[PDB]
Write a protein that binds this ligand. Structure first.
Ligand SMILES: Nc1nc2c(ncn2[C@@H]2O[C@H](COP(=O)(O)OP(=O)(O)O)[C@@H](O)[C@H]2O)c(=O)[nH]1
Ligand SMILES: Nc1nc2c(ncn2[C@@H]2O[C@H](COP(=O)(O)OP(=O)(O)O)[C@@H](O)[C@H]2O)c(=O)[nH]1
Ligand SMILES: O=P(O)(O)OC[C@H]1O[C@@H](n2cnc3c(OP(=O)(O)O)ncnc32)[C@H](O)[C@@H]1O
Ligand SMILES: O=P(O)(O)OC[C@H]1O[C@@H](n2cnc3c(OP(=O)(O)O)ncnc32)[C@H](O)[C@@H]1O
Ligand SMILES: O=CN(O)CC(=O)O
Ligand SMILES: O=CN(O)CC(=O)O
Ligand SMILES: [Mg+2]
Ligand SMILES: [Mg+2]
Lengths: 431, 431
């Protein structure tokens, strides 16, 4: 107890959009603190409660919980205009006094308008050069994380300190990018002015996140929830590089993005969609570009919560999941969108990859090798029944139960939740 | 046990060069695997054994241990020429068959010659512009971590796959930098050719680090040691930004740099020098630019193991140490270079900072605020006796013991080791 309490973590086990927003929302009901540790607003997390639906991006999904404090960690890159723009969209949905329960770490880096603009330019440039780009959300996430590493980026604490100093580096940073993209137009005083405004708006919410989390973990017992963004296979280190996002979406990102030791990390839940989706460029072994893909894409309403882009769809892929578990060490899983499969007579599930007629011993570090593998499946029998109404383990029909077990067994991790709808109550807790 | 074994970690608690090489060497004697998780060869870790001295940079310090396997994780950025150049320097010291016990993660990013060249240029540019630069080791660490985030950098697996594809992106990446520094000269085919050579040299050592560490942690019990590089206050997120290195030197870096969950991290030792040193630009509250600084710098032989640069010296600083503990959650400490203090009649120790005559509640996120604080000290009585010979807790004289306790008490972390020399046997294990 001297060490402190342990946070609960919700992580994406695939290529994002697995249902982290829904899982976090569920768990956030009785949490004292809900936080984001990495990424920016490239994330799109959907929460449904009482017929009311919200789409969060920078705001932690537990922001709707009026008793809880939503915290944005130092690992997150913030675009201030987008933040308020987002918060103000949810005001119109009933989000009241959110600015009263939102803490922002003063070490978080800032996404500047030219970062997003550079994001665009770099994509058009890679496309109109090598034929294809990464397919980023063009939210300037990659550019801003690149300025962070370079140590040229600015942080919250910078914006709130002397503004004349800030403006000095801001002008200099901008110029640096214009050197990358001469055709890049930046309204220095224009943007810089708005920034000056934002400073006073955010100021009251800002704090030292390190002391904040530390004090929280060692003071009277509290329940802290960490909302992962993106997912394992999108991890800058472990994902399908270079077709990944620019932050560590894996468990280690919790430590680096909030400044807490591995001794303060409790349960780490892996959010697993019953089938796989990917939005953007890059290998997708079980991708189904056919009638099956369309049923999944359509029945699942698979379109970017952030870009409106239609997501690619495929069968469940155990190779990526097992790989994800090796890096995150999930304590239990949340198997989502099981109901999407209610209508299939049979459901194929990828179990291994084969390159030269030979099976691969492990998930390829080289993404191109992945674009050449021939996955071998395990056809399972559908249940052809509506499960959207199930609320208990028994409500599920026989073949639905077998599907959950198939997942538990081939991964070696227990399924603690089963999603059968997008609304908070459309959940089944198995233990 | 189902989860697996837990690794032991050695981290720097200050601004580097605290003695991690000496601590790792000590602990590596009976380790099965010793690894690096972040940084590159900007690191300089000194090991002394049997009168024989080694200076490691990319090679894990446990490389001298012939029974153990030295592993370079995916969080590390490698400059191949420097790696062999380093390994070949230690051959001339008796390092035999090292290439037989060195594993290299195939996801590690590559530092290219132009990265180091860009490092130089950027420094000269910041200096000859705003008056001062960061004071990097000019090993191209910042530039290569910036290419990683941008997803433009290349990795081991890339170098070893099709070389024609590699060369394609290599040429493109180079051009990108020349756009940053037009005066930057790159011998594409020249460098690219050498790279082609290195590929075959490193190839046999490369492996999938994720599967490697995973298998190691779950197979028959083994002892894995993780050698941190740089230190807490140099952390890209938590250090004295922008006067920091470009990787997470804190505990979370172990998870992201090796792909292991917080559940596989055991003891995390903080290496603490009895006084503080910093090499490069940036705030240094207890810095002693005087006769005291010279005695410390001189008696301690404080000059860069990597750049030959004379390190800045100051009294011990508890503010940074306590802050370091908040982020790393040290389980025990290694108080090094206690013997350097053998001659002082009294020893001042910084306990808090004061900005406006008022004490600060916590370590400033803004580094400039740090350049304005007035530290308040706690003068302790020296022992004025030679401790270089002590090997037990009792050998130490009264005032030496009080110094160790002062540290244990003001940090809330136990000192498990006390350094009284640079040789492996010049250690005292308190428990
Ligand atoms: N039918 C159904 N929809 C679900 C379920 N869980 C989540 N969803 C929806 O699936 C979508 C997942 O996209 P997204 O919100 O981006 O996931 P996130 O980015 O991981 O938070 C959302 O529109 C959710 O409402 C489930 O169990 N069943
Ligand atoms: N006298 C003395 N020297 C020590 C002790 N521990 C380490 N050193 C020396 O202090 C220096 C620390 O620099 P460095 O090797 O860069 O530390 P690292 O980068 O943290 O591994 C080395 O030259 C060590 O040999 C100690 O207890 N006493
Ligand atoms: O540089 P970026 O803008 O991050 O784009 C890099 C790649 O990563 C993808 N991507 C980024 N965030 C994603 C997300 O987040 P959530 O699960 O939190 O809703 N869900 C799905 N895909 C996501 C993009 O489509 C792109 O291929
Ligand atoms: O971009 P970089 O080349 O990393 O420089 C950024 C800043 O970080 C410092 N620095 C980097 N590695 C260091 C080291 O490592 P070890 O403790 O492992 O031996 N020990 C001390 N100082 C170190 C540099 O002096 C500089 O101010
Ligand atoms: O929910 C977020 N994503 O799916 C990203 C996007 O819309 O591209
Ligand atoms: O041991 C490494 N450092 O001290 C870095 C340097 O020499 O600058
Ligand atoms: Mg989403
Ligand atoms: Mg060193």
């Amino acid at each position: 107890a001297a060490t402190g309490s342990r946070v609960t973590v919700v992580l994406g086990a695939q290529w994002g959009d697995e249902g982290k927003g829904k899982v976090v929302d569920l768990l956030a009901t009785d949490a004292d603190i809900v936080s984001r540790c990495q990424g920016g607003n490239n994330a799109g997390h959907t929460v449904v409660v009482d017929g009311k639906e919200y789409d969060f991006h920078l705001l932690p999904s537990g922001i709707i919980n009026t008793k809880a404090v939503s915290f944005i960690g130092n690992g997150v890159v913030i675009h201030l205009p987008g933040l308020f723009e987002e918060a103000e969209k949810n005001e119109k949905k009933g989000l009241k006094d959110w600015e009263k329960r939102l803490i922002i770490s003063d070490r978080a880096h800032l996404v500047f308008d030219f970062h997003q603009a550079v994001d665009g330019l770099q994509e058009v440039q890679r496309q109109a050069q090598e034929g294809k780009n990464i397919g980023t959300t063009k939210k300037g996430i990659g550019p801003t994380y690149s300025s962070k590493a370079a140590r040229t980026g600015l942080r919250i604490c910078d914006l709130l300190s002397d503004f004349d100093e800030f403006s000095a580096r801001f002008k200099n940073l901008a110029h640096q990018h214009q050197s990358m993209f001469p055709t890049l137009e930046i309204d220095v005083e224009g943007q810089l002015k708005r920034l000056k405004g934002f400073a006073e708006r955010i100021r009251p919410m800002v704090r030292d996140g390190v002391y904040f989390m530390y004090e929280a973990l060692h003071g009277p017992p509290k329940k802290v929830l960490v909302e992962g963004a993106n997912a394992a296979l999108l991890d800058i280190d472990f994902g399908t590089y270079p077709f990944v996002t620019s932050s560590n979406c894996t468990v280690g990102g919790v430590c680096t993005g909030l400044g807490i030791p591995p001794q303060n990390i409790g349960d780490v839940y892996g959010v697993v969609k019953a089938y796989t989706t990917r939005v953007g460029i890059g290998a997708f072994p079980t991708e189904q570009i056919n009638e099956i893909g369309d049923l999944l894409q359509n029945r699942g309403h698979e379109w970017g919560v952030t870009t409106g882009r239609k997501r690619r769809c495929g069968w469940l892929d155990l190779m990526i999941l097992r790989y994800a578990h090796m890096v995150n060490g999930f304590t239990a899983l949340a198997l989502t969108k099981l109901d999407i499969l209610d209508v299939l007579s049979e459901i194929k599930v990828g179990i291994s990859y084969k390159l030269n007629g030979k099976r691969i011993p492990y998930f390829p570090a080289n993404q191109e090798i992945l674009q050449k593998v021939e996955v071998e499946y395990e056809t399972l029998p559908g249940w052809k029944a509506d499960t959207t109404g199930a609320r208990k383990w028994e409500d599920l029909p026989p073949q639905a139960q077998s599907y959950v077990r198939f997942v538990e067994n081939h991964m070696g991790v227990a399924v603690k939740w089963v999603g059968v709808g997008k609304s908070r109550e459309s959940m089944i807790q198995l233990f």
